Amino acid sequence: VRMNVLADALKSINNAEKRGKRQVLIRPCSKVIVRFLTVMMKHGYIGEFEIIDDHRAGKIVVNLTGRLNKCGVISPRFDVQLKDLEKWQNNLLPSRQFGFIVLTTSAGIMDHEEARRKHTGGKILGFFF
């Protein structure tokens, strides 16, 4: 069933941007969704998303742009110990020149660059690039 609500959503916003779809809604919604999408907003990977408030769960509607090649999700949230952060961002991103492993540490949800500035580890969620 709905186990992981990212994988759910991120499939459907990778899986639109292939078709070139202009915008998409994501059915279940969550806090973690919002908080990881707002990360994608900063590096440009999407445009402004506007969350509907069906009284229950939430829907979102994501303005897409052309720019997202793929976003995916590492499904079990392994615990990343900062020394490993490299070994991951080697084998999970296309280059050292862009690509963003979104993860979730002590000091909020954020990309790997921002966990490195603050010097924290924590749990991998996914990656967009």
Binding site: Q23, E50, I52, V61
Partner: protein, 83 residues
């Protein structure tokens, strides 16, 4: 295709969508404030009835229930408009 303004969907194309599939989940049902010929009394019948709606008076019976909406009996009116 390539541009469907999902957030501002024109009123028609939610009514041709299954209740839970809509942008916001709303029902496709209603109550009706019902006259009936004998008594002037108005009962507050819910379209999709399930049970037989009897008159606040007594004798007459308003709504046989069927699959979807309720079958009003013979010659009796109703009033949607609200909310």
């Amino acid at each position: 295709p390539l541009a469907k303004d999902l957030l501002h969907p024109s009123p028609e194309e939610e009514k041709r969508k299954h209740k839970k599939k809509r942008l916001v989940q709303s029902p496709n049902s209603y109550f009706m404030d019902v006259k009936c010929p004998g008594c002037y009394k108005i009962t507050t019948v819910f379209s999709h009835a399930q049970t037989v709606v009897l008159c606040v008076g007594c004798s007459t019976v308003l709504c046989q229930p069927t699959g979807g909406k309720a079958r009003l009996t013979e010659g009796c009116s109703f009033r949607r408009k609200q909310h």
